[PDB]
Amino acid sequence: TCPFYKKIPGTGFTVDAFQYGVVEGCTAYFLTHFHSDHYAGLSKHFTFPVYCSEITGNLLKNKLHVQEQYIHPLPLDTECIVNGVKVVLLDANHCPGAVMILFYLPNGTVILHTGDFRADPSMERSLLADQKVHMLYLDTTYCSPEYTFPSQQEVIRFAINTAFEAVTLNPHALVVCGTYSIGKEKVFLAIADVLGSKVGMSQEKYKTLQCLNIPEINSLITTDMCSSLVHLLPMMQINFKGLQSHLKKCGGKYNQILAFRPTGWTHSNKFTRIADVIPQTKGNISIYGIPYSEHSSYLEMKRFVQWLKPQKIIPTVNVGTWKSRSTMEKYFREWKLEAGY
Ligand code: NI
C-alpha cells in the first residue's frame, strides 16, 4: 500500500506514487523527476492528472507514451493553483527536469518536498527565502557523515584533463562513458567538447537526450558511432569483457579504451582525494570510477536544513530499517540543538 511519506496531508495529493494502483483519495499525482524508482507504474493507460516539469512531461509523452491530455507541465519559479491549492516548482539540482515542490495548505501550513536533490547555497535565494516552511519531506540518500564528495566542477575538471591527456598521447584511443538513466550528462558532454567530437550513442539514448531542452544539443550528440570518438554505453557494459567486445566492433579504428563510470559514492572517498584517483587496468583498457553525485553530501544536506529550520522532517530515503530511521533521527536532533531552532 502507499506509504505515508508519499502523501501530502490536507490535500488530495501524492508524490512519486505510481506503483500502488489507484490511491484512494488522490485527485492529483505529482512526479518530481524521470527516474524509474519514481515513475514506476506510469504508461499510455494512465488516466489521472500528472503534474510535473516541462522536461519530465516531454519524457512521459515520448518515452512512456502517456497521453497528452493527462500531462500537466508547470513552469518553474511560478505560483500555480492545482485543485484549489497553491504550489511552486523549484529546481532540485538533480537530473534534467527534476524539481522540489512547495505546497501552501489552506490552513496556512507550508510543506517542501525535495524529491531527489543536491542541496546548494543558491537555493537559499529562491522563493524559499520568502516564507517559513513547517514540514520538510527530505531526500536522505547520503544522510551520514562518511558521505563526503567533491564538487561537480572538481570532478569534471579531473575527467576533462585525464581524457585530453590520453587522447593527445594516443590519437587512436577511444573514450567510453557509462549511463543507465538521465543525469550526469556533463560528464560525457564536457569530455566530447575538449576532444572536438560529438558523443555517439544508440537511437534509444539519443531520443531520450532530445527531450531535455539542452542548448545546442544537435551540435553535441549523434547516432553515427563511426564519426565519434566518445561513445556512450549501458553502465552494464563498463567492464573488461564488455569493453573488449566493443573495441572489436570498431574495426581496427582504435587500439586503446579509456572508460568512465560515474558512480554515486564509493569508500575510496573516506581516504582518497580526487587528485589521487587511479584506474583499474587490464591490457589496453583502463576504467575510472569518478564520484560525480547528483545527491546532497552529508554536509550540504546539514547546511540546507540548518538554514531552513523546519518544524518537522519526514525522510523519503533509507526508511526501510529501524537502525537507519533511528540514526537519521539522531542527526536531525543534533542539527536542531547546534543551530537553536
Ligand atoms: Ni533520482
UniProtKB/Swiss-Prot annotation:
Induction (UniProt): During mitosis. The mRNA encoding this protein contains an internal ribosome entry site (IRES) in its 5'-UTR. This 5'-UTR generally suppresses translation while specifically promoting expression during mitosis, when cap-dependent translation may be impaired.
GO CC, alphabetical: fibrillar center; nucleoplasm
GO terms for MF: 5'-3' DNA exonuclease activity; beta-lactamase activity; damaged DNA binding; zinc ion binding
A single BP term in Gene Ontology: double-strand break repair via nonhomologous end joining
Disulfide cysteine pairs (residue numbers): none
Consequence of changing residue 295 to A: Impaired nuclear focus formation, reduced interaction with PIAS and increased sensitivity to cisplatin
Main location: nucleus
Tissue-specific expression: Expressed in brain, heart, kidney, liver, pancreas, placenta and skeletal muscle.
This protein's UniProt keywords: Cell cycle, Cell division, DNA damage, DNA repair, Hydrolase, Isopeptide bond, Metal-binding, Mitosis, Nucleus, Phosphoprotein, Ubl conjugation, Zinc, Zinc-finger
Protein location: Nucleus
Function statement: May be required for DNA interstrand cross-link repair. Also required for checkpoint mediated cell cycle arrest in early prophase in response to mitotic spindle poisons. Possesses beta-lactamase activity, catalyzing the hydrolysis of penicillin G and nitrocefin. Exhibits no activity towards other beta-lactam antibiotic classes including cephalosporins (cefotaxime) and carbapenems (imipenem).
Family note: Belongs to the DNA repair metallo-beta-lactamase (DRMBL) family.
Subunit text: Binds constitutively to TP53BP1. Binds CDC27, which is itself a component of the anaphase promoting complex (APC). Binds PIAS1.
The name this protein goes by in its record: DNA cross-link repair 1A protein
GN (gene name): DCLRE1A
Residues represented out of the complete protein: 700 to 1040 of 1040
